[PDB]
Scaffold this active site. Structure first.
Site, PDB file in Angstrom:
ATOM      1  N   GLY A 108       2.191   0.069  -0.268  1.00 54.52           N
ATOM      2  CA  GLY A 108       0.868   0.484  -0.665  1.00 54.52           C
ATOM      3  C   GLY A 108      -0.085  -0.679  -0.563  1.00 54.52           C
ATOM      4  N   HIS A 118      -5.423  -1.347  -9.184  1.00 49.41           N
ATOM      5  CA  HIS A 118      -6.135  -2.346  -8.393  1.00 49.41           C
ATOM      6  C   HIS A 118      -7.643  -2.061  -8.362  1.00 49.41           C
ATOM      7  CE1 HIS A 118      -3.118  -4.993  -6.872  1.00 49.41           C
ATOM      8  NE2 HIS A 118      -2.395  -4.029  -6.334  1.00 49.41           N
ATOM      9  N   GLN A 160      -7.648  -5.499  -2.523  1.00 45.77           N
ATOM     10  CA  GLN A 160      -6.701  -6.560  -2.169  1.00 45.77           C
ATOM     11  C   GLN A 160      -7.087  -7.294  -0.898  1.00 45.77           C
ATOM     12  OE1 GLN A 160      -3.098  -3.806  -2.995  1.00 45.77           O
ATOM     13  NE2 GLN A 160      -2.252  -5.905  -2.994  1.00 45.77           N
ATOM     14  N   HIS A 176      -0.038   2.291  -9.585  1.00 45.15           N
ATOM     15  CA  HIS A 176      -0.185   0.868  -9.250  1.00 45.15           C
ATOM     16  C   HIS A 176      -1.463   0.617  -8.407  1.00 45.15           C
ATOM     17  CE1 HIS A 176       1.598  -3.159  -7.965  1.00 45.15           C
ATOM     18  NE2 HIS A 176       0.638  -2.968  -7.086  1.00 45.15           N
ATOM     19  N   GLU A 177      -1.661   1.423  -7.366  1.00 46.34           N
ATOM     20  CA  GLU A 177      -2.786   1.227  -6.454  1.00 46.34           C
ATOM     21  C   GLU A 177      -4.108   1.598  -7.109  1.00 46.34           C
ATOM     22  OE1 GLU A 177      -2.394  -0.537  -3.940  1.00 46.34           O
ATOM     23  OE2 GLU A 177      -0.209  -0.488  -4.053  1.00 46.34           O
ATOM     24  N   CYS A 209       4.115  -6.404  -5.414  1.00 44.71           N
ATOM     25  CA  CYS A 209       2.697  -6.376  -5.068  1.00 44.71           C
ATOM     26  C   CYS A 209       2.451  -7.427  -3.993  1.00 44.71           C
ATOM     27  CB  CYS A 209       1.850  -6.703  -6.300  1.00 44.71           C
ATOM     28  SG  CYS A 209       0.090  -6.417  -6.051  1.00 44.71           S
ATOM     29  N   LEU A 210       1.737  -7.065  -2.928  1.00 42.62           N
ATOM     30  CA  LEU A 210       1.402  -8.037  -1.874  1.00 42.62           C
ATOM     31  C   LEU A 210       0.510  -9.191  -2.356  1.00 42.62           C
ATOM     32  CD1 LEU A 210       0.895  -5.743   1.230  1.00 42.62           C
ATOM     33  CD2 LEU A 210       2.945  -7.061   0.541  1.00 42.62           C
TER      34      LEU A 210
HETATM   35 NI    NI Z   1      -0.435  -4.251  -5.684  1.00 39.75          NI
END
Ligand code: NI
Ligand code: NI
Ligand code: NI
Lengths: 168, 168, 168
Positions: A45, A136, A50, A132-133, A90-91
């Protein structure tokens, strides 16, 4: 294009995204670049915030064959129930993982890549990813759910990753 | 956003860019990301094809303080004269430099970031950068001007660099 | 602190300085050390690159009572006119002097020691001093304007001087 993914402790990760006014060709380029970035970094995701684009756009792919593109533009949570937790990655917090409390089942409304509305009921991994997304987009990270000591250990491990990645 | 810059020997670097149909908000987003990328990488010029956008868009800043933004959309060369050469670099051929034959003076017409036409006469460093960047748009790199054995030296240097910079 | 001033033929004198990102306490210490160095050596101008600090900072004080300090951070030349020349010196070219072509009148924009912008019109000695110091920041020396034979002679003079300097 492959975009650069922000890492903690970048403060741009804390910004609250605006809703998309109109799903046009510009937005569709962003969506396509976001998929390209997510597959390149091998994530499942990615949220626009991000990659320093502060609009409500999320891309997801939780499929084993990596060929199942889900786009959420202007997502809205209609219903949730239950509680679960998985060790999330998470990236933007590279190589760290932690269990975080989530709803087990989620029902959302969103626009797709064409700007057509749709509803989606999700459970399992998909439900967790969507939550989660969506976090953000309001400037929340999974480490925010953890104790002050855990948060510090995570920040430190990431700042060490990035020192070395940067080696003069 | 900061975009990924392609390195040789990527084949997408050899693609011929299409002219921009209409300078709209999508194009202006690309222009802004291209400046952000160029400054991040500390270059003085960047063509769209270097970030895998195959449209005729160039950004340049040859100023000492890094605050003089020049945008060329759909550039055309009207006149050139003279001949020069400096040791040129390129973000797509990292850390390599070679003297390349260029015209000393150049007169171009282009569209700016607003899509308004303008004419520009250049000499010196600016003239050289414009020609270097216009070359990109037709899939041409500065190493193309050099002997087969220097071309081979440069490709190897860059591959060593990247290989031996790629930990997972 | 008094910093060491580089002499030709040091190659660090040929580096191009980066603009100052933010005028903070670190930059203000550099400015103060540069003044202290210039007065110690009895010069009237000093560029940061002369002391191996490669940022766009220049200090100038022509005053007799060492009490009319001028700081140029990130200077830019807005306008110039006329042509002059006096026999210039330089702390990096010990004891040598040569007439060099300059603009007579110069208008510049810069930041002061507090980081506030200002404009300055100069003629006479000040105009020449500003051009001389702005040259240092892009790696130029006054000897670059002279014939090859004149340049070789100056280089030799300085090397002979520094040779005697060091004794054992
Ligand atoms: Ni993330
Ligand atoms: Ni290039
Ligand atoms: Ni000097």
């Amino acid at each position: 294009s492959v975009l650069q993914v922000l890492h903690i402790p970048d403060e741009r990760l804390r910004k609250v995204a605006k809703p998309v006014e109109e799903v046009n060709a510009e937005i569709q380029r962003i969506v396509d670049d976001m998929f390209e970035t997510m597959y390149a970094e091998e994530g499942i995701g990615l949220a626009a915030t991000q990659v320093d684009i502060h609009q409500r756009i999320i891309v997801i792919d939780v499929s084993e064959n990596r060929d199942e593109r889900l786009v959420l533009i202007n997502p809205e949570l209609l219903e949730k129930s239950g509680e679960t937790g998985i060790e999330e990655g998470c990236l933007s917090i590279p190589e760290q993982r932690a269990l975080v409390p989530r709803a087990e089942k989620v029902k959302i409304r969103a626009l797709d890549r064409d700007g057509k509305p749709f509803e989606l009921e999700a459970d399992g991994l998909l439900a967790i990813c969507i939550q989660h997304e969506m976090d953000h987009l309001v400037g929340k990270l999974f480490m925010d759910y953890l104790s002050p000591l855990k948060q510090q250990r995570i920040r430190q491990k990431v700042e060490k990753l990035d020192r070395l990645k940067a080696r003069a």
